[PDB]
Structure formats: structure tokens, C-alpha cells
Amino acid sequence: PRKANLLKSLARGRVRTSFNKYNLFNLYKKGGVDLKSKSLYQQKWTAKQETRAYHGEHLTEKRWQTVFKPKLDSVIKETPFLLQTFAVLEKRLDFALFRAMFASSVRQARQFILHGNVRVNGVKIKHPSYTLKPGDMFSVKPDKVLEALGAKKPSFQEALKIDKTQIVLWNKYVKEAKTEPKEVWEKKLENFEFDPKWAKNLKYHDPIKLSELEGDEPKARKLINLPWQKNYVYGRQDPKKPFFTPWKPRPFLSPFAILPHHLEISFKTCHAVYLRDPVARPGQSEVISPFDVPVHERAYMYYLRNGK
Amino acid sequence: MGFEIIARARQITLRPENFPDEFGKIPRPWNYFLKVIAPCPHQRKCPLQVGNPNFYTHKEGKDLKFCNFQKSIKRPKFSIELKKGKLLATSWDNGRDYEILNYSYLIFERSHKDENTLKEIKKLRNENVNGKYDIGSLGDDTQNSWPRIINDPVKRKGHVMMDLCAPSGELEKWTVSRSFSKQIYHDARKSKKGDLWASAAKTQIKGLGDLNVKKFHKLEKERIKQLKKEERQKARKAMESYNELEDSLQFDDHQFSNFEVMKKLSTFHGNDFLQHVNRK
Amino acid sequence: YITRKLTMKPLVMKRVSNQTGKGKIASFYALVVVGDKNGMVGLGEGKSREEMSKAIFKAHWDAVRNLKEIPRYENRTIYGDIDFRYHGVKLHLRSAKPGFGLRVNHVIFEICECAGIKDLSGKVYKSRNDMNIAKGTIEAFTKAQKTLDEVALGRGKKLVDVRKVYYS
Amino acid sequence: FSRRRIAYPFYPFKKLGRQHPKKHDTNLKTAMRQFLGPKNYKGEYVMNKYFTVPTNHVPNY
RNA sequence: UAUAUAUAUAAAUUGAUUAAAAAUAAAAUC
RNA sequence: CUAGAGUCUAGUAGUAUGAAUACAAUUAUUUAUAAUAUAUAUAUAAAUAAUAAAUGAAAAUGAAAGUAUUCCACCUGAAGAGUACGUUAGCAAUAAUGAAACUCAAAACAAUAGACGGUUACAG
RNA sequence: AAUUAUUAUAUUACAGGCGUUACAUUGUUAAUGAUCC
RNA sequence: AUAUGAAUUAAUGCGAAGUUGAA
Ligand code: SF4
Numbered sequence A: 001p002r003k004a005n006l007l008k009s010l011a012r013g014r015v016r017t018s019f020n021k022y023n024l025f026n027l028y029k030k031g032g033v034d035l036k037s038k039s040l041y042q043q044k045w046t047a048k049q050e051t052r053a054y055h056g057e058h059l060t061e062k063r064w065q066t067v068f069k070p071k072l073d074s075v076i077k078e079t080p081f082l083l084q085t086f087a088v089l090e091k092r093l094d095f096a097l098f099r100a101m102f103a104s105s106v107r108q109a110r111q112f113i114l115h116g117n118v119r120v121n122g123v124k125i126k127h128p129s130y131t132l133k134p135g136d137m138f139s140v141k142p143d144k145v146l147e148a149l150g151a152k153k154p155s156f157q158e159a160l161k162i163d164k165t166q167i168v169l170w171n172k173y174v175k176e177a178k179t180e181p182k183e184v185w186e187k188k189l190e191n192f193e194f195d196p197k198w199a200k201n202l203k204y205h206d207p208i209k210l211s212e213l214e215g216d217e218p219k220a221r222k223l224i225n226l227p228w229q230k231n232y233v234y235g236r237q238d239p240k241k242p243f244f245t246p247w248k249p250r251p252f253l254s255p256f257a258i259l260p261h262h263l264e265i266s267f268k269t270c271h272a273v274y275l276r277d278p279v280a281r282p283g284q285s286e287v288i289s290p291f292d293v294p295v296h297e298r299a300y301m302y303y304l305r306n307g308k
Numbered sequence B: 001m002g003f004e005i006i007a008r009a010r011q012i013t014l015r016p017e018n019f020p021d022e023f024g025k026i027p028r029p030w031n032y033f034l035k036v037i038a039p040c041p042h043q044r045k046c047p048l049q050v051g052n053p054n055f056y057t058h059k060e061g062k063d064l065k066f067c068n069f070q071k072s073i074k075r076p077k078f079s080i081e082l083k084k085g086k087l088l089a090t091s092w093d094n095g096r097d098y099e100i101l102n103y104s105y106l107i108f109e110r111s112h113k114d115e116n117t118l119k120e121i122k123k124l125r126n127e128n129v130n131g132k133y134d135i136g137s138l139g140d141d142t143q144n145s146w147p148r149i150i151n152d153p154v155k156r157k158g159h160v161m162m163d164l165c166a167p168s169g170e171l172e173k174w175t176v177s178r179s180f181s182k183q184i185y186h187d188a189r190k191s192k193k194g195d196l197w198a199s200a201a202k203t204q205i206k207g208l209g210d211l212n213v214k215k216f217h218k219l220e221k222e223r224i225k226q227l228k229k230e231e232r233q234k235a236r237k238a239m240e241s242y243n244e245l246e247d248s249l250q251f252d253d254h255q256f257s258n259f260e261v262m263k264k265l266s267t268f269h270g271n272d273f274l275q276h277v278n279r280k
Numbered sequence C: 001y002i003t004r005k006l007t008m009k010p011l012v013m014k015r016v017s018n019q020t021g022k023g024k025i026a027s028f029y030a031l032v033v034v035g036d037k038n039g040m041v042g043l044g045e046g047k048s049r050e051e052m053s054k055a056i057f058k059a060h061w062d063a064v065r066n067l068k069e070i071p072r073y074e075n076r077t078i079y080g081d082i083d084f085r086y087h088g089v090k091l092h093l094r095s096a097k098p099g100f101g102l103r104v105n106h107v108i109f110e111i112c113e114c115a116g117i118k119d120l121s122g123k124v125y126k127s128r129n130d131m132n133i134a135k136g137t138i139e140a141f142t143k144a145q146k147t148l149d150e151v152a153l154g155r156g157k158k159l160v161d162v163r164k165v166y167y168s
Numbered sequence D: 001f002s003r004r005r006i007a008y009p010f011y012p013f014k015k016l017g018r019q020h021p022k023k024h025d026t027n028l029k030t031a032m033r034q035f036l037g038p039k040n041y042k043g044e045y046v047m048n049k050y051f052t053v054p055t056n057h058v059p060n061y
Numbered sequence E: 001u002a003u004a005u006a007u008a009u010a011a012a013u014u015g016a017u018u019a020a021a022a023a024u025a026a027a028a029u030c
Numbered sequence F: 001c002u003a004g005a006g007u008c009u010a011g012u013a014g015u016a017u018g019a020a021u022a023c024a025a026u027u028a029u030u031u032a033u034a035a036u037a038u039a040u041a042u043a044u045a046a047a048u049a050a051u052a053a054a055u056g057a058a059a060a061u062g063a064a065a066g067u068a069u070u071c072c073a074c075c076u077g078a079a080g081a082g083u084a085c086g087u088u089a090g091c092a093a094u095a096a097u098g099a100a101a102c103u104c105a106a107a108a109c110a111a112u113a114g115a116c117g118g119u120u121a122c123a124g
Numbered sequence G: 001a002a003u004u005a006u007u008a009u010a011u012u013a014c015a016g017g018c019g020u021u022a023c024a025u026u027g028u029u030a031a032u033g034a035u036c037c
Numbered sequence H: 001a002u003a004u005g006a007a008u009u010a011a012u013g014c015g016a017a018g019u020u021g022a023a
């Protein structure tokens, strides 16, 4: 397939099927597609660029042309008929994984499939192009779903330095509390909206040395006793798991958390069911896209004639 | 306009920029070679050349100067009989026996096709460059490269000042005095416009005044570099105007009046079309 | 109403000369279409000597003035086929199924987009001038189109009778 | 008229001014930084509204 | 059971002096 | 141009807004009949002129260049070319039929504004 | 004697120039500046 | 007859800056 390159470039500003921060900003700053002061060919080309950046970036153009279905399906508000231009892709396995929130990208879902982490009706499918029929149940290994929806596991060095800084700031807080305890308690209540033993209960912590703690993670595990992370380096409660182990949702997840209509998801088991092919209905389309109907109809007119 | 014509012809024929740091007169290519006989005393660029004639017509062009040349001719009978009447012999709203005629002119001399002239020109351009002729220099000190008196010499007690196109090629003020000598003062004191002056002077400074053509050469080059800022400014100028439009028209508070809003749309497309044809 | 709802799109923008004795005088012609996308459309023309902006300005006002209601079937297409001759352009336009695109000439595309004609398939024969295409397009849209209700009333029939029977 | 248009933010943002020649920065990166906010020592961007997920059954888009 | 950590210094490739960018592209990490 | 006749006859040869049918609003003139008592500013027809609608790229057409039907002939960018070759007739002259390669992005029509003409007059 | 002045005498910056507009900007209907002796 | 070559020979196409007539 297409070799990923400059997918998230800010100058180009093309939105991609990804949960990435750069993709989030590209979606944020775009506003809307500009089809004005343009000939029909230029409008069609812009619509192709915008829509084809999102729906099937990996698909080769001459392959997408063959996959493209000129005949669409539709089951007071207006039916958005031509948002179904890319509904054919929604039955591909990788797209189903991405829409089920079992991956942070269509490319990541592709790697999950190709690396044998995906099953469809209990048979391991290793081909991203496998098309889902209605009623199929597909599952992903829970470790990979947790990695996809979790923060990056810090290296040992990075988390060790983060712990260094946390000890520094915790010592600072307890120092300032000891100096001026009464108003510290009162002003903490001020945000939350006297017992002098309060500051007495708080206890210092010893600054660690990177040179001496390097390369000894079991030792560093015992040496940390912060109130919030007791006896584990930051983000590495069990260092043998693929994710930030005190499991934390990945950054910038709310913008891209859409619950698809055509899939029924079980996050507890990392399973999903393909209810139906996405279908447009009055005032609503089940093809999750960031572009308006004019862009989709321009892309549809492009692909009907193949750019003529 | 005529001065512009001669200047352009000289530029395209000699192509001064194609031979930088080459002073003096050696025939120039255009088995074909040509040189300037007169009036020009140098094959380098013309110091008086401003590209467009129309800018002689502007308020700022009210002191620009051109390489004209005057002469006097006595009227024959018919002109005397002809230039009489209200129509032709009055202020169109005393008589003379002669007319002062203005004209610009140019001359080229062509080299001889031969095994001699071609190698001669080639070797002259190779081995003996004539160095950087300084302001004040007399070139080769032969009639070919003498400074030409391009303005009427101004003469006062003891001293004659001359405005010259120099074989170095810069506008020059040369002052002769009774001091520097008696004979040189005598000759300069009979010097006139259109003559080649051929001696040394006590001061040979640049002809600073109305060298604004060099100031104009700056302005045009400013435009070319900053012309490309113009479209780029115009982009944000119109973008922010329309981004303001869409905000309050998508929000639809319509602080901007219906008359004025549709004026913006007129500017948006009008600016678009004008950019189209400018490519052509 | 006018600014917020109506959309303006330039259709023609050109320089036309009127060579006078002294020299070539060049003016700017602009032809625009204004439509609310909800069953009202109009065309406008403007001619300005000094800058095209004024041409488009007067064209926008003229289009606003000639804004007219346009018959529409299901608010998405023409009621039936329209075969229309206008000053040398032959427009053959066909209503289409829901979801069908605007598979027409570009000028007709902007006109339909402005006027809310979602569905159409057409061909332009004989001359293909954009000017004449647009004028004939609007004329054939409004003169050459009759509503099923109007046809039935003129024939004194109920809509159930006039409506076509389904065959397969 | 189509132009290769660098996808600058539609909203207004604080652009670059006079820059140290070795900064080698672009307006888009400044827009990125202003959209995110300061970067925490942990690598987070707490100041943003979108860094953290909602928790009251109301999606934050 | 705290948490918008803040300060300094040092550097900072190509182009450019800001809506002129190359460029999240590299490296690095999981 | 050819033969026979005493200049004539007999010739060879074949150049230099298609036809029909059905229908189609007025006005004004005439034109030819048919009446009724010069008057009915008489009706029915055809010819002429300006229209309406309609057609057309327009000029313009406007009972046809309109609405329809039927039959035939003809056209497929400019130039090469109505040329070459062959055939057909002709003593011959000529006529008919009639290409091809090469070259080009032209070429043409109606109308608009202009400057041009010994183009016209007319004025100031 | 030191200083300050004034007054001479030297002292050189210079003064001087009906030199420049192919030397400009003001001002007006000469001045400043730039340069030149 | 279908082809392939030909001294000798007919016409025409192009282009270079021009030359000559006044159709
Ligand atoms: S000013 Fe000098 S170079 Fe320029 S045209 Fe006159 S003589 Fe020639």
C-alpha cells in the first residue's frame, strides 16, 4: 500500500483517520473546505484531496477506483445521499477496527491485523482487506487495544527523571506547608470550594541520583515512596506491559471518540459486531466523516468519471 | 522619447551587462562585431537611461535629463515665407533667421570579416583589459574615448565648468581654471556642448545632480521584490476581510450592512480576476 | 434575508472591447446567479469600464431583482424532461433518481447548485456558449416546466390518476 | 482560481515577529503551540481542554 | 495525596525576517 | 465545330430558397366575383405592404426561411483541385465522372464599434 | 607672577567666491545644505 | 494482371528574406 509520508504536515492540513495530536490540530484549524472562486475541476480536485486524505489514505488510487461503487444505498429533514461515497470502505476490517476504537489509526489497525492480533468469528484473519458481512463478530487482543487507547510507556530514564522532579516538587510543597501551615490549609480549601498536626503528618522524601539509580529499576522501585506513586517508577507499575501501566487514557482522546452506529462494541472484552453496512437516513449519515455534503458530492462526481 | 529609443537600441546592441568590468571601446558581438563611434564615449551602460518614457510626464520627473543634442540652421526663403501668420508664427495660446533643432543620434561602426579582425577582437578582450578607468580619466586619450560635453559649459571669471559623459561612464563635473593652466582655460572657455573635451582638470567630481535615474533604478527594483509581497499582503488583506465576513455571517449578527457585505464579495471576485490576466 | 440566505456565484467574467477612434476601450462583463438553494433563483449581468468589481456589483443587484421561484419536483429535480432551444443552444435535461449527482455541463451545475436542483442529467447540443447556456437554462427551468398539480388541475384530474403507474 | 494555500488557521493567532536567525520557526508551529499551551515536565498539555477525557457522559468535541 | 512547577544559562542545519517555509520531517523513545 | 446541300439546311454537344399534402392572428390597400338596396364604409376569395406569434447565429423570414408529413438531390475544415490519371461520348474542341500524398490551425458567415477611400453629399 | 578679559601683533580652522540647479530641499515669485577654488 | 525498381518527365505543397505588377 501507500508508504506513509508527511501525513500530519501542518502546511498541507489534511485530516487523517488518527487520534494523533497533530491530526487534532489539523482538524481544528481547517475550519471548512474552500470550494469558492474555483472552477468545477478545481472544486472536484479539492474535494478529492480533502475526502481521500481521510477515507483510505493507504489505498492506492487505481485500487480505490476499482473498489469505488458508483451505485449507493439509502434506506422534513434531507437525506445526505452522497455522504455514502466512501461507505464501501466501512466494511473493510481495518476500518472496522478503527471505528470500533480498537486502534488509534487505520494504519495501526492494519498492523494489528497483519500481526495476528485480530479474529473474525474466531478465525485469525491476517489480511486487512477482509470484508465484514453483517452480523460478523470480530475481536482484538486486549493488550493491543489498551496500548492503542493508552499513553506511551515512558522509558526507564524518562520516568526516572520525572520522578526526580516529582520528589523535588513534593519536598517544595511540604517545606512551604511547614513554614506557613494554617493559611496553606485554608487556601487549599479555597481551591477545594485548623489542625497544626496537618503539616506534622506530612513527611519529606530523599532526592534521587540518576547516575546511581541508572540501570537498576528494581532498586529504583523500592526507593520511591511518594504518596500517589508508592514503590513504582512513574508510568511503569508493571514494566512488562506495552502501555503506561497505571492505565491512563491517551492524550487528546475526547475529540476523536465517536461511537459508530453500524458497530456494536464491547470494550470490556475488546469485541465488536458489524450490525450493518452504513446507510444514510433523513438528516443523519452513519459514515463518520469530517467533511460536509458538498465536498462529498464533488468527490463523488470526480470518481464517477474518474477525473474527466 | 527619442533619447529612450537610442538608449534602448544601444542597450540591446552592446548589451552592457554582458561585459561587466570591461572599460573602453572594443567591438561587441551582437563573426559579427560592432562598436560605438559617437556620441557615446564608453561602451558601458548609459548613465542617463530611465526605462519608461511616460515617467518624464510625472511631477517627480520634472527634473530628469536626457542626452539631446542641439544645432542651429539658418532658415531658407520658403521657411521664412512659410512661418508667417497667426496660425504658425504666433504663440499658439521677434522673429529669427534660424532654427535651433534638437535631436538625439547614435552611430555604430562594423568590424571587417576576416581572419584578422576576429582574432584581434578576441585577443583584445582576453589579454588586455583596460582596468577600472577612474572618474576623471580620459580613457585611451584618443578621440574614441574622450569625454563628451553633454551640457553647455558654464563659464565665469577664470573657470569653466563642464558636465561630461566620461569614458569611465559616470556623469562628471570637470572644472578648468586659469590656475591649473592658461591654455587649458582658454580651450575650455571656447568649449561648447557636443564637443569632446581632452585634457586634465583640477576637480573631476561626479555629476551628482539629477542622478536620480540611479535613484529610480532603485525604485523599480524595489517594486519587483516587493511586488511579490503585494499579492502576499493582498492574500491576508482579503482573507481576514472575508474571515471577518464569514464569522459574523456564519454567526449572522450581520453587523456588516447588506450593501457593504455584497461589496466585499465584489472585491473578492474582482481581485481574483485581476490576478488571472496578470499571468498573461 | 437576502445576504445571509442567498448565495452568489460568478458564472461569466470577461473583458469586452469597444474599439473607439482614439484607442481600444476595454470594459468588464460579469454574469452571476443568485439562489437560496430552496426553490428561488435569478440571473444578473453587469458591465463596468473601470474595474470588474463594479460589474460584479451591478450583476449581483440585477440577479437579486430577477430572483424568481423555480418549479421543483420533490425539491430535488425537474418535473420531467426539458428539451429547449435558446438562441442556438439545445438543452436536453432529464430528471433523475434520488442520490443521482448533477451530471450536467458546469454552467448548469452552478445554476442547479444555486437553485437547489439536486438531481439532473443533461446534454448541451449546437452552440456551447456559457452565456446562452445559463440564460436558456433558467428559461427552460421556469417556462418549459409544469408542475404535476398544475397539469392535473388543467386537465381536471386528481393527482392519484395523473401519477404514473409502476411497472417492473 | 486555485492556489496552493498553506493551511493557516482560520481564526486569528499571535504570529511570529522579529526572530533570532537560528530560531528557524514557522507560523504553523506557533499556532500549534498556542493551541496546545505549555508542555508539562511529564510531557502533558494540561492547559488544553482536549487533553483530558470527559467523565460526566457528555462528549467533549 | 500534592499537582497550570518556575528559574536560569547554553546551543539551535537550509531558506527567509513573518501569515516563508523545509519540518513531525529527522534523531530519540515505546 | 461536324457533315449534306449553293452561302444555306441537317446537326454533334448539353453548359453559363427542389416537389407535394394538412394547418397557420391581424391590419391596410387593391384585385375578381357574388349579392343587398351611389349605399350596405357589403361578404367571399387571390395579389401587394407593414406586422403579431413563431423561427433564426443573426441579417432576415413572416402564409414561408412557421407548425407537421412524404420523396428526391446535395454537404462534411482551408489549400492541393474540379487538378492528375483512367474511363465515357466526341474527327477534334470540349464535356461528364474524379482522387491521392504533402502543408497548415486555420478558414468562413451575420452583426458591432472604429479609422480609412479620388465614397457621397452637406454644412461650420 | 597665575587667571580672566579688552587691545594690538602673529595663529589656522578659515573668511571670501556675480562658482555651480547636468547642485538639491525649503522659502519665496534670497537662505540652508552639498561640492568645487 | 497483381506487384517491385527505373533514366526521361507532369503537377503541386512548404519555407528564407525579399524582387516585380496594381488584379
Ligand atoms: S549620456 Fe553618454 S552614454 Fe548616455 S546616450 Fe549620452 S553620450 Fe551615450
Ligand SMILES: [Mg+2]
Residues within 6 Å of the ligand: D002
Ligand atoms: Mg493551476
Ligand SMILES: [Mg+2]
Residues within 6 Å of the ligand: none
Ligand atoms: Mg540561514
